Design a protein that fits this description.
There is one protein chain. By secondary structure, this protein is of the alpha/beta class. It has a single domain, classed as 4-Layer Sandwich (Metallo-beta-lactamase, Chain A). 26% of the residues lie in helices and 26% in strands. The strands form 2 sheets. A 7-stranded mixed sheet has the order 1-2-3-4-5-6-7. A 5-stranded mixed sheet has the order 8-9-10-11-12, with no helix packed on it. The longest helix is centred in the C-terminal third of the chain and has 15 residues. The protein starts with 13 loop residues before the first strand and ends with a helix. The structure holds the ligand C=C(C[C@H]1O[B-](O)(O)c2ccc(Oc3ccc(OC)cc3)cc21)C(=O)O and zinc ion. Ligand A1LXH binds next to α2. It is classed as metal binding protein/inhibitor. Keywords: METAL BINDING PROTEIN-INHIBITOR Complex. The assembly is monomeric. Metal Beta-Lactamase VIM-2 in Complex with MBL inhibitor B9. The protein: Metal-Beta-Lactamase VIM-2.
């Protein structure tokens, strides 16, 4: 069973195998007096790991490199951050100290820089317009347009039919919207449209927080987003 916020102390990381060669990683952090779970992804590429997103924090990110070593024993060589918030780029520095090459669209690198977060080293050319898609290691990086943020990328894994939303995709259990400071809620439902078109074979969808399910999360996410905006 997938882990939830109550089962994981701040500073510890769990790994959940979605598929052969494919894992989420789940951490917890204390943010605005509250305690939140958080997802990211790990994809096997040869004798090598691609890491999608930090574990939200330097401490949590060292911990995730350690659980990866213990449970998988392959080296993390690159990381992609799927937008500029601290739950996606915080720990980037631990990853770079460790030899990981860190990536992000240049939207992200800039926004990260303004907010004063940690900045991935390398730019992902090729995504600066909706529906754009590019291959990066064994996944496709797809840019759906503004949603959660102006820069959110989602990640698809064709080998396994695994779609990863980042925070642009809400878990099914979610009733209400999250951080909307940097969102554009009018397009968000159409960006989820583009996703739906590109990736209709997706057998697994992994929200940026909470439990994975199928492509129902997509409509469910748009449901949630519309409620918020009609209130
Ligand atoms: C679950 C969440 C909130 C949690 O997830 B998240 O990716 O928006 C996120 C981003 C950054 C977070 O740290 C900050 C948030 C706002 C801020 O501005 C002052 C400064 C730091 C916390 C979260 C969600 O679904 O949006
Ligand atoms: Zn988030």
């Amino acid at each position: 069973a997938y882990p939830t916020v109550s089962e994981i102390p701040v500073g510890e990381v769990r790994l959940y195998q979605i598929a052969d060669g494919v894992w989420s990683h789940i951490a917890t952090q204390s943010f605005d007096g509250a305690v939140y779970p958080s997802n990211g992804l790990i994809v096997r590429d040869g004798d090598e790991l691609l890491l999608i997103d930090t574990a939200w924090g330097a401490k949590n990110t060292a911990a995730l490199l350690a659980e990866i070593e213990k449970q998988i024993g392959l080296p993390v060589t690159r990381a992609v951050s799927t937008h500029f918030h601290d739950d996606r780029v915080g720990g980037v520095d631990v990853l770079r100290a460790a030899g990981v090459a860190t990536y992000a669209s240049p939207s992200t690198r800039r926004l990260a820089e303004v907010e004063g977060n940690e900045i991935p080293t390398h730019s992902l050319e090729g995504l600066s317009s909706s529906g754009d898609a590019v291959r990066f290691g064994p996944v496709e990086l797809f840019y759906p347009g503004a949603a959660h943020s102006t820069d959110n990328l989602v990640v698809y894994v064709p080998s396994a039919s695994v779609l990863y939303g980042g925070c642009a995709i809400y878990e099914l259990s979610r009733t209400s919207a999250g951080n909307v400071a940097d969102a554009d809620l009018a397009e968000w439902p159409t960006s989820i449209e583009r996703i739906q078109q590109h990736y209709p074979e997706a057998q697994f969808v992994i929200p940026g927080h909470g439990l994975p399910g199928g492509l129902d999360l997509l409509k469910h996410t748009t449901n949630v987003v519309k409620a918020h905006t009609n209130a």
